[PDB]
Amino acid sequence: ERTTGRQAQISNITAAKAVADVIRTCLGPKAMLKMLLDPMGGLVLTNDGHAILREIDVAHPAAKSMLELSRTQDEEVGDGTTTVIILAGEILAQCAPYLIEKNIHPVIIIQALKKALTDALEVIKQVSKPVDVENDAAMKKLIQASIGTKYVIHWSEKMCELALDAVKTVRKDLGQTVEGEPNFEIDIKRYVRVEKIPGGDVLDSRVLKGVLLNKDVVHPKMSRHIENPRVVLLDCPLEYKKGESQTNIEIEKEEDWNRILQIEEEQVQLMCEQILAVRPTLVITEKGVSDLAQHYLLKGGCSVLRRVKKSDNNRIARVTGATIVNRVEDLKESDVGTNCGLFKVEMIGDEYFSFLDNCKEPKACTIMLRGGSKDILNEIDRNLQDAMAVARNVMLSPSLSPGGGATEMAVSVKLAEKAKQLEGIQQWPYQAVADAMECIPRTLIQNAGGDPIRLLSQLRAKHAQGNFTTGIDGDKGKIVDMVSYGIWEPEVIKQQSVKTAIESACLLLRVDDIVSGV
Amino acid sequence: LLNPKAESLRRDAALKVNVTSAEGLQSVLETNLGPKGTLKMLVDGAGNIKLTKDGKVLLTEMQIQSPTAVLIARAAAAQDEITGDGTTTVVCLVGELLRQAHRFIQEGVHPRIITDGFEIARKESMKFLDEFKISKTNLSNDREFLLQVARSSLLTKVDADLTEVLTPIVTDAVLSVYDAQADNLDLHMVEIMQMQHLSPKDTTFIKGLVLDHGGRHPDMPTRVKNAYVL
Amino acid sequence: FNNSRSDTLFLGGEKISGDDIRNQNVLATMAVANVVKSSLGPVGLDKMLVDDIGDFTVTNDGATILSLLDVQHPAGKILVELAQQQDREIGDGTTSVVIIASELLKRANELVKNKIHPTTIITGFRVALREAIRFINEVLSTSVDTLGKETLINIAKTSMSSKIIGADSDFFSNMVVDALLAVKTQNSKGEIKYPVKAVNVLKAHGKSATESLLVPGYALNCTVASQAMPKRIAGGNVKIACLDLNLQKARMAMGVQINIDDPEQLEQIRKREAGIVLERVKKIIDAGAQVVLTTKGIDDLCLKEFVEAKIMGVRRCKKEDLRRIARATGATLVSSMSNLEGEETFESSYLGLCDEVVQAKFSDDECILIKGTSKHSSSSIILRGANDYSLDEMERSLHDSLSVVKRTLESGNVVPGGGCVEAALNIYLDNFATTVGSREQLAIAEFAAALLIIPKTLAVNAAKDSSELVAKLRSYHAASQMAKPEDVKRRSYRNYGLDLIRGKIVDEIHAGVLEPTISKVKSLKSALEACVAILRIDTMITV
């Protein structure tokens, strides 16, 4: 019913500690397998952190907040799902004795977590090292981190080309002191939307700039490409129009019957004549096209496309600029067909397609993927999004940070040094943040099999005297430098990792009561 | 760290249950192996008793709640589609390998090192697999060697008296369907038909096809030799 | 523990009476009030509201928590309806009103153990409430300290401290305070309120944020478009014409094309297309408009007519700004020029009025400054910042800042917050208790001491000691109320409240924490009526 006093603070930390404790063995490339027991006779052997917690039914509401935290992390970064949840769960565990046994007010701890978050972001920027974002050979070795241990490792070179050529098309990199700096905005969601074509080879997969249409041309003999195109978009079909009111044509006189039959053909030509007034080279309609409208527009020297989806024409309007106008008599001259390179109808996989591809980058592109089957295309799809997500974090900041527990320990050492110079009651919960940062590398040690206490203190000694680039090896499990075998990941992953971790930790600390009601 | 209506086995306690789960499935299937194996009963619940020594039919007819035996049964089903023989052999290798590993788990050895030791030894096992194997000639006059392969697949599931009955049947069934060349063989061309009223030791091979409905009339010829077909 | 099993008054349910229902009302009201006790004040913490489906939500708003809280008891149900009465009058403060009524019931419950009848306990609270309203009258004051000093800048400084804008905020708070006081207006029938949507905010990045300018009037971003026309007109007055439809050469339609078969129709239709808009330009010059603001632009031929007359034309004005300029100039934005069969600007009808129009040089920016129109009571802010992302955070912060400032100043009657009202009434009613001297003196004394729960729990949520600050809060007011009624003073030094950010006692009037009087008077009035409704229950029949 109601949880008052310190009982609510216990249940909020315990719920977040239980969610993190499950995936502690899910961290690292060597991470163990989790066998889940379904209410039925089935089982789940998947080690993916998101696929596990999704199949785990939770009761306490703080556990549901940790589930929604991983959903936000999945939209930002493609990997490291368990890294954020374990880190956010350990911070509440380390602040638990200070909140109760030491009797520190929670607002003091929350204000201390905001100071530790700002200091942590500064340390990550200091331990991060720059890399050339314009080097094609360097970007392939970066994305390769999210490539290997997958079926795409053989095509990885082609997987990086499809990843780079896609983000480089939709990215706008600008800055100045006049109109401001967009800070290298890249949209993978809307603009990079992909079309998967079965059959063929991965080498034949191209990134097309434009909107791809699966519908063919109404007539076999027609202009294949136009130099300076004029495009008209309209939802209305092409056929004889009828009045919305009651229309009855009574024919008595003998010679007036054939005249009305000619007018019906003239009305179809009139609707096409209103389109030809702007001299379009391309006509795209949502519904079908009558055979008469096909012949009238064929002699008019324009291209006709039929049975095109409405959602596709909306994406065409942004890369082109032609606005959909229902009635042919209302067609504006302001909307044009400029920046369309080729109409090429070339057949791909025994199926006629239509290409809107151009020579320019109107902040969007359509990726054409080829594979050996639909399951291969689905594997290329999800891997391409993770491939571009890594390339996105590299284009959203030049600096790379060492992984494998190197950055995790590098921050914890600097937090311990700033703790001695930070006066006030917030010093005690500030030291709990550094102890929570040591949980991630110690977790990789526990999954490796080595002594967690011995290897952690020795790894901390490497950061204190030597450099911060000495991490833990995944294959071996012994303390080594990350410069030898680069595990290096972009900094944006570490940025949003500690960022949302403090926001999720403070959110649960602010709730002192839980009641049930509608 | 618990919520209502939940159960969790943690901190090496799941390993003691999973290894025991393999020891329970192993000891049941340990009884039937090779020609000296044993026969078991499978009740479908409808009252039909079925006796078979094949581990493929056994694992499908039994229902096991233990999730460790489920993965063994699912993986053996993939082995039954690929290999088609040695279902018990795979189970006996899995159970004993976990027993030898569980002894090292009690010693404090991390399971990753244990699994890494299996993959390294498996790669070395594949090297000895190619060295120990014997290359047999492609000659189809090898029936003498096919008599040895037949007794391998027969003697296991039978009293060895049906072996001498089924040895010329199975060996002649393969070579008659198989043309002489390297092309392929079709198992669908061999029909499997069952009849009652006569002892199993009288099982014979049919070079042609067998059918049920015959000519009905007392004066129709019973034996017609070298006749045209319509 | 639970009360049940009447075995009296045979009916379809139980009977609870005596100290059984009196103790039940205290336990029920306490559990309902304990939810909003930790959310009191800005230092309070939000709590989670879970439904029956298993979903939840987290918010610190006391109006939403009490509305979504499930109360199965009638004593707490009055508190639920109390939040509805508080939302329909003031709209805010449900958190503090519940805490008051909760402590008043606890104080009245101890009076029952003192053998004091609850009827006099009710009347004893009503008599103290009549004086409490009169005591607020010596507390409350009008708008003060806005000349010679600024107490309003401390409000904007604390609100913008969470944004990048808070660095220069000391200079930026002066821009918000000095503008809001100058934009004061009167809408209809003596309201005297500050305009909500006024004080236009524009942004440009050429430089640092310190260079942001405050214009006493509207700043429109536009040019003259021709160097032959003068950049400064209107010494005495000007008539500004806000226009939408273009003055450009008129076409017919975008889908029709003009094909000339007869060369006579060529010159005819040509000069007719320009002649339609040229006459519309003639109606503007004859209307006495020195400044012409057009949304869709002006042609070159029609602009030359403005050059020869020294009339200022402007092309492609922002239509969203012209709507607010027309309201200040008394003008009306013309979307198309016509009435019935005619076309004209009606000779200074749709036209506006303004004192002066001057075009300042902003050092790589150029705009039009509008100052002193007919009835405006508005201004405009030209922002400069580190980048557009900074200018976006500034415009959002100036709206979040001014909003807190303008709502409190909208009511000309405010009282100091931070616990000043609750602590001051505790001192006044303590001396007023000696004016009765029979029975209610015990009820009035507990009524005044019950007001100390508001500053108490307010300091608890701030991670500060409530035993010290509250004890010091009463000492400063008690010593200041010694020489105050005698009309002889060395130094007054009253109105010291609680500062929970720095953990020290400061003057709330100088700190900028103020609440309107209508909020505090109706709070004690609503909390008392809810406490009386609980004290009036001597019996409960539960089916």
From Swiss-Prot, chain A:
The keyword Transcription regulation does not apply. One of its GO terms (cellular component) is chaperonin-containing T-complex. SUPFAM superfamilies: GroEL apical domain-like, GroEL equatorial domain-like, GroEL-intermediate domain like. The keyword ATP-binding applies. The modification Phosphoserine is found at S245. It holds the Pfam family Cpn60_TCP1. It is found in: Cytoplasm. GO terms for molecular function: ATP binding; ATP hydrolysis activity; ATP-dependent protein folding chaperone; unfolded protein binding. Disulfide bonds join C359-C365. GO terms for biological process: chaperone mediated protein folding independent of cofactor; protein folding. Keywords: Acetylation, ATP-binding, Chaperone, Cytoplasm, Disulfide bond, Nucleotide-binding, Phosphoprotein. Gene3D superfamilies: GroEL, GroEL-like equatorial domain, TCP-1-like chaperonin intermediate domain. InterPro entries: Chap_CCT_gamma, Chaperone_TCP-1, Chaperonin_TCP-1_CS, Cpn60/GroEL/TCP-1, GroEL-like_apical_dom_sf, GROEL-like_equatorial_sf, TCP-1-like_intermed_sf, TCP-1_chaperonin. Molecular chaperone; assists the folding of proteins upon ATP hydrolysis. Known to play a role, in vitro, in the folding of actin and tubulin. In yeast may play a role in mitotic spindle formation. Heterooligomeric complex of about 850 to 900 kDa that forms two stacked rings, 12 to 16 nm in diameter. Belongs to the TCP-1 chaperonin family. This is T-complex protein 1 subunit gamma. It comes from Saccharomyces cerevisiae (strain ATCC 204508 / S288c) (Baker's yeast).
Curated annotation (Swiss-Prot), chain B:
It is found in: Cytoplasm. One of its GO terms (molecular function) is unfolded protein binding. Keywords: Acetylation, ATP-binding, Chaperone, Cytoplasm, Nucleotide-binding, Phosphoprotein. One of its GO terms (biological process) is protein folding. It comes from the Eukaryota. One of its GO terms (cellular component) is chaperonin-containing T-complex. Heterooligomeric complex of about 850 to 900 kDa that forms two stacked rings, 12 to 16 nm in diameter. Molecular chaperone; assists the folding of proteins upon ATP hydrolysis. Known to play a role, in vitro, in the folding of actin and tubulin. In yeast may play a role in mitotic spindle formation. This is T-complex protein 1 subunit zeta. It comes from Saccharomyces cerevisiae (strain ATCC 204508 / S288c) (Baker's yeast). The gene is CCT6.
UniProtKB/Swiss-Prot annotation, chain C:
One of its GO terms (biological process) is protein folding. It is found in: Cytoplasm. It comes from the Eukaryota. Its main location: cytoplasm. Disulfide bonds: none annotated. Keywords: Acetylation, ATP-binding, Chaperone, Cytoplasm, Nucleotide-binding. PROSITE patterns: TCP1_1 (PS00750), TCP1_2 (PS00751), TCP1_3 (PS00995). It holds the Pfam family Cpn60_TCP1. GO terms for cellular component: chaperonin-containing T-complex; plasma membrane. Gene3D superfamilies: GroEL, GroEL-like equatorial domain, TCP-1-like chaperonin intermediate domain. GO terms for molecular function: ATP binding; ATP hydrolysis activity; ATP-dependent protein folding chaperone; unfolded protein binding. Belongs to the TCP-1 chaperonin family. Molecular chaperone; assists the folding of proteins upon ATP hydrolysis. Known to play a role, in vitro, in the folding of actin and tubulin. In yeast may play a role in mitotic spindle formation. Heterooligomeric complex of about 850 to 900 kDa that forms two stacked rings, 12 to 16 nm in diameter. This is T-complex protein 1 subunit alpha. It comes from Saccharomyces cerevisiae (strain ATCC 204508 / S288c) (Baker's yeast).
